User: Fold Periplasmic beta-glucosidase from Pseudomonas aeruginosa PAO1.
Amino acid sequence: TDKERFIASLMARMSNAEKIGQLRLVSVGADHPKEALMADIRAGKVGAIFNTVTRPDIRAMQDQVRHSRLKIPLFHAYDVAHGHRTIFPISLGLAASWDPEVVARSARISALEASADGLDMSFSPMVDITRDARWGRVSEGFGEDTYLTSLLSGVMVRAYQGSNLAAPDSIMAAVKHFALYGAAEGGRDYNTVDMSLPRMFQDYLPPYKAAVDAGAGAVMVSLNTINGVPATANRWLLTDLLRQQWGFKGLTISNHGAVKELIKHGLAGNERDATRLAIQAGVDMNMNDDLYSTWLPKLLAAGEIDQADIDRACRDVLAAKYDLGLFADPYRRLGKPDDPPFDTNAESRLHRQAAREVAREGLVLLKNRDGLLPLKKQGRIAVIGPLAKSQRDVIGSWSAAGVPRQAVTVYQGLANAVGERATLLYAKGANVSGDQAILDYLNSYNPEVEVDPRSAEAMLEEALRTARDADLVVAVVGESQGMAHEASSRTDLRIPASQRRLLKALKATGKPLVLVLMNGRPLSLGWEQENADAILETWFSGTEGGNAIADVLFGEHNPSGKLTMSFPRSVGQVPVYYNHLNTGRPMDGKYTSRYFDEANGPLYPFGYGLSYTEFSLSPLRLSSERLARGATLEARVTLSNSGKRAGATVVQLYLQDPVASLSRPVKELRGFRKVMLEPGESREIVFRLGEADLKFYDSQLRHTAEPGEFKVFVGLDSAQTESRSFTLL
Amino acid sequence: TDKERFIASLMARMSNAEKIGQLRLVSVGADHPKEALMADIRAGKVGAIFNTVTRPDIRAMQDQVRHSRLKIPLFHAYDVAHGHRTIFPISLGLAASWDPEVVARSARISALEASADGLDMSFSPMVDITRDARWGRVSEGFGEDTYLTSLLSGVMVRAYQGSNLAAPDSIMAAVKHFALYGAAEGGRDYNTVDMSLPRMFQDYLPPYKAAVDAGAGAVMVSLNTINGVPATANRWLLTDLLRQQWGFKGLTISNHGAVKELIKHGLAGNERDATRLAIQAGVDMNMNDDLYSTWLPKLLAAGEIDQADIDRACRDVLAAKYDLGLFADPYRRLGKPDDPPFDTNAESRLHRQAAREVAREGLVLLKNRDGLLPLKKQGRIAVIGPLAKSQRDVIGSWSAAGVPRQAVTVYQGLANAVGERATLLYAKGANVSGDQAILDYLNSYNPEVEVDPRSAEAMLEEALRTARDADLVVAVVGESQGMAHEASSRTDLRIPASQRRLLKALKATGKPLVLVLMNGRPLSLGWEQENADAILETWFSGTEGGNAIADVLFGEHNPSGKLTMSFPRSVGQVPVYYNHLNTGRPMDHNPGKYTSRYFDEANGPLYPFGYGLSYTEFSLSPLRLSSERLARGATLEARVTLSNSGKRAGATVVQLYLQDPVASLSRPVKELRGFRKVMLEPGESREIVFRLGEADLKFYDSQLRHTAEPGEFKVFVGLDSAQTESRSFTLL
Ligand SMILES: OC[C@H]1O[C@@H](O)[C@H](O)[C@@H](O)[C@@H]1O
Ligand SMILES: OC[C@H]1O[C@@H](O)[C@H](O)[C@@H](O)[C@@H]1O
Ligand SMILES: [Mg+2]
Ligand SMILES: [Mg+2]
Assistant:
């Protein structure tokens, strides 16, 4: 009530002009020249800033607040998605570590670095469920599984916000994108999402609720329609669900120009009506389009909105600012005015140990023919491909304040790891695409992709000549980070054709071929699975990616990472995901649910990933065959390292309700342990199962466990498991 | 109440054993040997038969009924989808005619032929909305548009059932598949369907309701889940919607083994519980698995079901049998006991005139560089490809009693059309697929696909040598009918790789290249659009396909057919459909990077909805609305003048689309709301007048309120969904 008292008496001091000013979130750009923005801050007409990311620059803004009547401090936000200055792997890569503590360490250090530069808030975590590999932004999520994405959503929020949001090394988590954004039709970004309420509540919503339950201070609203209604004008989503049902008590933030876009959605004929829909639906804070400042006064004058609409939004902004401690000290994350200046991008402000150690855990070994990996640090190694010496790509999309020049490439990683003991030979081999239209797209806003001016044939001859000089080729191939961005939807999930032509040429030299993959989404790797001697999935592995990849290639680390998203054989099988419904005619037969013109199932399933050692599980044992209401069951299995090398695997518990009021999925992830074992080491794993893990949203959204059979699965991926059954009473 | 009285007094006479017997629908096969089935009919334990399709064979069954106590007649059903013995184009092809009377003529003659053979019912029309070209069964539907599929659903039902269901040349329409079956995830057949109730009511359901409103005597229930609940156990779908809300008064029929499959759906641990869910959800008649006969007695004994559950289903079966006139004369479609025997597949029992005249209307001219088509009947024409001399494929999937041997191939069609005036040279050029696994699948039960024992290279050399001898190549390519069947879902929408290798070789000879396409779904034709000199979409055009294709190729007919389903550039763009939502960041075909689009391919469809070329040129005058305000209960007039401004007689389809740019839901960028197909002679002009009222402006909102909101409405008019002009009015 200290906070309630403080807020109530500040808002009793405030005019509607000052209140509406608090709802305005802007960045320096064409729409808002720097100096007219500073003038707006001095006049009490700006609530917050995004995309201003250095102490001197953020100090300069907060300094303008003393000129306003009430001196209400700004908060400063940025897209700290998977690192601020020290870049960790893209979220899809982090998820692949299957280790909350690893994911937490990336968020803690992100918060530490961003706070240290003056930032109060990150538009993070992105926790949208993704079953469509075509979608540009799958790189920003944690994959396709509801349980894993929901858990890591909670982990990220608690790591960022820490023990106290006032703390100088804590930032506010603004979870995104609320809601259902990953389910765009055709995987086209911003596009229509349409689904049943049972699927919505069971599969897609839980990650947002986890962020709320973990204490997320903010929620960012999505650009997409939900069953005909844009989320930004969806009163049901933002008021009935978010506030009245989940009990969210924080700040709602519009997406970039999302209020104005209600016109193109066909929900409003003009900006006046677009504003009314958004504030009355439950959008507090308006990003960039400034429709709130332009129209909220006139809507109130004409009775089209209530004072309570303005007050709800303003109180939310002030409560956020309060919990960040900005009313106690606006400069608590900006040092002291007499502090000596520093180089923001100084080497000593980075966390390279952390980045390298996190980057190792998420690398996924997909293929290793006749123990080719790990490599010895001897002989001549050809390092070939357009992503081998790429600093821009290895830090991935949404790379915040990450500096390309400070990033360790895959080539450099190998250079450092072999020293003078092996000879590395380099050849680019191909451009990332051989299609000038795709190169035009990738280089459209910024020059993201360095184009060799030579012919494909010239580059291939040079690559072939390098392979011939070498004992083995390490091909570094896949996507440029510009291919797994916002709006970068693909019709083709394969490696680009220029690089596939390179890989076939390289295969034909007869040299052992190791594939180091870079990608922000599941790829189509039919050919690579038949032909490559080994494949390593490195996603975009960040600032210290090259070192972490070199550590795994030379056996300093044993690949432990496993997929959190199913890899389709082709884009034609989209969507494919492990927790699908059985249907009345499950494919194992001509008259089953399947394609005829391709092998069925995914190439690599959910939970899949190889190691340099071999693991075994003892028989699955349940503590009983009946479970009483309010009692707790124990699934017990013994994991061994039955190979020669130390290493980690992930023991995954799945669950099936084979008889239910709805057709339930064939299995759903409900627990896991990542376990490091020395050779011969054994760990008894014990899973606790209760009524909470058996529940689902029925036809009428009743969240219920029904009595009857439950099947418990345990294995090292969703494909290779054993089941044992019990009964709920 | 004559019927109600009759039924009430029959059912008062009946035991539960006799009532449960009426719910049993079976076919002769492994599961039911012919003679044990006849014994079951005599014992009053069979309600109906499917897949028995000749008079002598159907007579033999109905003869067994006199041995039952109450002598309740059987009805006999079959899959008369697009013809019985004389096969018309696949439904997707029929839709492309944009002509109710053409679609009606195919259904009338289907009913006539099937009734003439003894059949009472067809599991038809299939009226499932299809936005996913990967799905095997898009060939059986009318495309992606709700308005067109809803209209043709009504047309098909009224054609089949005629003026009286008692009539000897009328059959009962059993509309399918209720419901949402075309929206399977991944386009994998039988697979999960999951959608909002606004999309369901606005886009997907109306065709089923049209069948009901047209007086469909029966509805067949789908195999797919709807939002977690199999349609077969979906009480909401079959009771609350179908009966209580739409007022359906006919018979519900399960799909093949659909009750038992509730176990694999994970809705039931056993057959006892699977039966209870299905009969209590509102499934009257049980197809093949016989769970109803095995379990309904014990469920009733133990109180797990009510007598009213049994009675509802039985009364429905009897009402269907009554309206077919089978209680007045079980042999009314089986002739008289004296009647002389005949050859069922006699040439004189076919309707070749009708099939040829219907097949012309749906052929779609996609490309015609420098008026190559129509061809003259002179010189040397190379006819190359694996579908050129294919009889089995041209009759398509769900070909009922259609005989391959009786079908006119594309080669034969051209042979008849040129007689002795031109030289046709033949070469197969490639096998339908070059993948032995796909050939194994296609030839798995029956040999559907003739594999040439020569090498691809040998066939290519022979094809190339034929092209060299010729003035122009007519390449006959696309899918085998086994590729657009039930469960034949594809990951690739292109022409098979063996035929694409053939087309590239042929292109490289420099000879004019005409593509005759055969397919049961939208194909990916990026390459063919850049490289072929002309493209003709022939779908599967049926028994008289070859003749109808030859008529269009030689200008006897002017291509009038237009697409009812959007053609994607690649499978990676699935789904693509004209009536999509704008989104908050629409791409402007002034491209932006941050719009709703793919980056690694051209965006939009290759060919849009309503698209199709002609041998002549048409013009439209400016669109004129009768006013700029429309009063509640009043009627607006959109008026345009269509001309033949070219040298040949021919038809086009003038299409009216509608947009509600401001609404409580984001509405589609446009929705089809009317059309005229118009034949014009050169220089001929016709003032077209569309009537628009409040009914055409309505939509299902967040809470399924079906209303027109006041405000702006935009009217579009053009010869396809791409190339239109708009004018606005206001509702008050
Ligand atoms: O710049 C901040 C925001 O910009 C928007 O364009 C994106 O949709 C958000 O996800 C992002 O966090
Ligand atoms: O063969 C009769 C019926 O069998 C079902 O399995 C099919 O799905 C229906 O379309 C068909 O009409
Ligand atoms: Mg149960
Ligand atoms: Mg309106």
Residues 615-729 of chain A form a domain with the Immunoglobulin-like fold (CATH 2.60.40.10). The CA atoms of residues 236 and 281 of chain A lie 8 Å apart. Residues 100-116 of chain A form the longest helix (17 residues). Chain A is about 30% helix and 20% strand.
